[PDB]
Scaffold this motif. Structure first.
Motif, mmCIF file in Angstrom:
data_model
loop_
_atom_site.group_PDB
_atom_site.id
_atom_site.type_symbol
_atom_site.label_atom_id
_atom_site.label_comp_id
_atom_site.label_asym_id
_atom_site.label_seq_id
_atom_site.Cartn_x
_atom_site.Cartn_y
_atom_site.Cartn_z
ATOM 1 N N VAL A 16 -1.099 -0.690 7.048
ATOM 2 C CA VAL A 16 -0.299 -1.514 6.143
ATOM 3 C C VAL A 16 0.566 -2.401 7.029
ATOM 4 O O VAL A 16 1.647 -2.007 7.470
ATOM 5 C CB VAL A 16 0.553 -0.675 5.189
ATOM 6 C CG1 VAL A 16 1.420 -1.565 4.342
ATOM 7 C CG2 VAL A 16 -0.321 0.187 4.312
ATOM 8 N N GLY A 17 0.105 -3.614 7.295
ATOM 9 C CA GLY A 17 0.723 -4.485 8.285
ATOM 10 C C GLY A 17 1.396 -5.689 7.651
ATOM 11 O O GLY A 17 1.004 -6.134 6.573
ATOM 12 N N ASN A 19 3.803 -6.459 5.941
ATOM 13 C CA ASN A 19 4.213 -6.465 4.546
ATOM 14 C C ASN A 19 5.447 -7.333 4.352
ATOM 15 O O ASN A 19 6.286 -7.459 5.244
ATOM 16 C CB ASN A 19 4.492 -5.041 4.075
ATOM 17 C CG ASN A 19 5.001 -4.981 2.653
ATOM 18 O OD1 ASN A 19 5.031 -5.980 1.938
ATOM 19 N ND2 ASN A 19 5.411 -3.798 2.234
ATOM 20 N N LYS A 20 5.540 -7.955 3.179
ATOM 21 C CA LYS A 20 6.735 -8.666 2.762
ATOM 22 C C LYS A 20 7.064 -8.473 1.294
ATOM 23 O O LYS A 20 7.985 -9.129 0.798
ATOM 24 C CB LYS A 20 6.603 -10.171 3.037
ATOM 25 C CG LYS A 20 6.425 -10.535 4.490
ATOM 26 C CD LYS A 20 6.691 -12.005 4.719
ATOM 27 C CE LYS A 20 6.287 -12.411 6.119
ATOM 28 N NZ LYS A 20 6.775 -13.771 6.456
ATOM 29 N N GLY A 21 6.338 -7.617 0.582
ATOM 30 C CA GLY A 21 6.559 -7.431 -0.837
ATOM 31 C C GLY A 21 6.894 -6.001 -1.186
ATOM 32 O O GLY A 21 7.595 -5.330 -0.428
ATOM 33 N N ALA A 22 6.392 -5.510 -2.312
ATOM 34 C CA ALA A 22 6.732 -4.183 -2.802
ATOM 35 C C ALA A 22 5.470 -3.349 -2.896
ATOM 36 O O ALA A 22 4.679 -3.528 -3.823
ATOM 37 C CB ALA A 22 7.417 -4.261 -4.164
ATOM 38 N N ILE A 23 5.291 -2.431 -1.955
ATOM 39 C CA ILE A 23 4.111 -1.580 -1.897
ATOM 40 C C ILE A 23 4.509 -0.189 -2.352
ATOM 41 O O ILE A 23 5.149 0.553 -1.602
ATOM 42 C CB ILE A 23 3.517 -1.540 -0.489
ATOM 43 C CG1 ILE A 23 3.179 -2.946 -0.034
ATOM 44 C CG2 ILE A 23 2.294 -0.677 -0.471
ATOM 45 C CD1 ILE A 23 2.299 -2.981 1.166
ATOM 46 N N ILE A 24 4.116 0.174 -3.565
ATOM 47 C CA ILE A 24 4.506 1.439 -4.169
ATOM 48 C C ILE A 24 3.247 2.247 -4.419
ATOM 49 O O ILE A 24 2.197 1.681 -4.728
ATOM 50 C CB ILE A 24 5.281 1.213 -5.475
ATOM 51 C CG1 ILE A 24 6.484 0.333 -5.204
ATOM 52 C CG2 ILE A 24 5.763 2.516 -6.048
ATOM 53 C CD1 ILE A 24 7.132 -0.138 -6.435
ATOM 54 N N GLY A 25 3.344 3.558 -4.275
ATOM 55 C CA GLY A 25 2.193 4.405 -4.491
ATOM 56 C C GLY A 25 2.101 4.894 -5.917
ATOM 57 O O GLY A 25 1.039 4.839 -6.537
ATOM 58 N N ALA B 13 -1.755 7.284 4.961
ATOM 59 C CA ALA B 13 -2.431 8.052 5.993
ATOM 60 C C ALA B 13 -2.627 7.282 7.289
ATOM 61 O O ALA B 13 -3.347 7.769 8.164
ATOM 62 C CB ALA B 13 -3.781 8.548 5.482
ATOM 63 N N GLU B 14 -2.011 6.111 7.444
ATOM 64 C CA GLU B 14 -2.147 5.372 8.695
ATOM 65 C C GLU B 14 -0.881 4.611 9.072
ATOM 66 O O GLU B 14 0.189 4.837 8.501
ATOM 67 C CB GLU B 14 -3.323 4.403 8.624
ATOM 68 C CG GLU B 14 -4.679 5.060 8.761
ATOM 69 C CD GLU B 14 -4.905 5.639 10.133
ATOM 70 O OE1 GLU B 14 -4.511 4.994 11.123
ATOM 71 O OE2 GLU B 14 -5.479 6.742 10.221
ATOM 72 N N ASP B 15 -1.004 3.709 10.040
ATOM 73 C CA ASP B 15 0.146 3.022 10.610
ATOM 74 C C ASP B 15 0.814 2.116 9.583
ATOM 75 O O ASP B 15 0.177 1.610 8.659
ATOM 76 C CB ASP B 15 -0.290 2.202 11.823
ATOM 77 C CG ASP B 15 0.876 1.669 12.625
ATOM 78 O OD1 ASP B 15 1.487 2.452 13.372
ATOM 79 O OD2 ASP B 15 1.184 0.466 12.509
ATOM 80 N N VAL B 16 2.114 1.917 9.752
ATOM 81 C CA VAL B 16 2.908 1.034 8.899
ATOM 82 C C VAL B 16 3.734 0.164 9.839
ATOM 83 O O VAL B 16 4.816 0.550 10.283
ATOM 84 C CB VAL B 16 3.800 1.809 7.926
ATOM 85 C CG1 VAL B 16 4.658 0.861 7.136
ATOM 86 C CG2 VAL B 16 2.964 2.654 6.997
ATOM 87 N N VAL C 16 -4.258 -3.261 4.304
ATOM 88 C CA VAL C 16 -3.453 -4.023 3.350
ATOM 89 C C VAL C 16 -2.548 -4.924 4.181
ATOM 90 O O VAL C 16 -1.469 -4.520 4.618
ATOM 91 C CB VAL C 16 -2.642 -3.120 2.418
ATOM 92 C CG1 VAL C 16 -1.768 -3.949 1.517
ATOM 93 C CG2 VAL C 16 -3.556 -2.245 1.596
ATOM 94 N N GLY C 17 -2.972 -6.160 4.402
ATOM 95 C CA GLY C 17 -2.311 -7.056 5.339
ATOM 96 C C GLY C 17 -1.619 -8.212 4.642
ATOM 97 O O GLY C 17 -2.020 -8.620 3.552
ATOM 98 N N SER C 18 -0.561 -8.715 5.276
ATOM 99 C CA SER C 18 0.088 -9.970 4.896
ATOM 100 C C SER C 18 0.472 -10.004 3.420
ATOM 101 O O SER C 18 0.506 -11.065 2.798
ATOM 102 C CB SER C 18 -0.795 -11.166 5.247
ATOM 103 O OG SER C 18 -0.706 -11.477 6.626
#
Lengths: 34, 34, 34, 34, 34, 34
Positions: A16-17, A19-25, B13-16, C16-18
């Motif tokens: 998960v690279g 990121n700039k928003g809202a990542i919710i599980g 389960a991976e990098d953030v 999940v990028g950018s």
């Protein structure tokens, strides 16, 4: 006689690279602005 | 006779990397701005 | 005699990028603006 | 310009009488025997 | 210009009497025996 | 200009009497024996 095992539940299984928003599980109720 | 085992639950389960927003795993109620 | 195993449930199985919006896996109720 | 207000989240909104078991509102992980 | 309000989320909206088992509102992972 | 309001989400809207099993509202993963 029962046997339950090795169930597996994932939400994000990779990177998960940048990121700039809202990542919710999992989200019960509640608002999200993005 | 029952037997329950080895269940597994993951959220990420991976990098953030290089995050700049709101990364939440589980959210009950509540607001998020991003 | 029963046997249940190795079930598997994923929500996102890759990168999940950018991101710049609202990436949710499971949402009960609640509003999302993006 | 945004405005978020008056959200409301309840788990039990009335009487809970003569209990003899396990009354939980939110449970992450963990076992319950009853 | 946005406006979000008066959302409402309930799990049990009435009486819960003479319980003898496992009354859960929200459960992530975890086992329940009853 | 948007306006979102008065949404409502219930899981049990009446009495829950003489229970002896497993009454769950929302369940992610996890086993239930009853």
């Amino acid at each position: 006689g029962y046997e339950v095992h090795h169930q597996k539940l994932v939400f994000f299984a990779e990177d998960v690279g940048s990121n700039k928003g809202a990542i919710i599980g999992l989200m019960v109720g509640g608002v999200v602005i993005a």
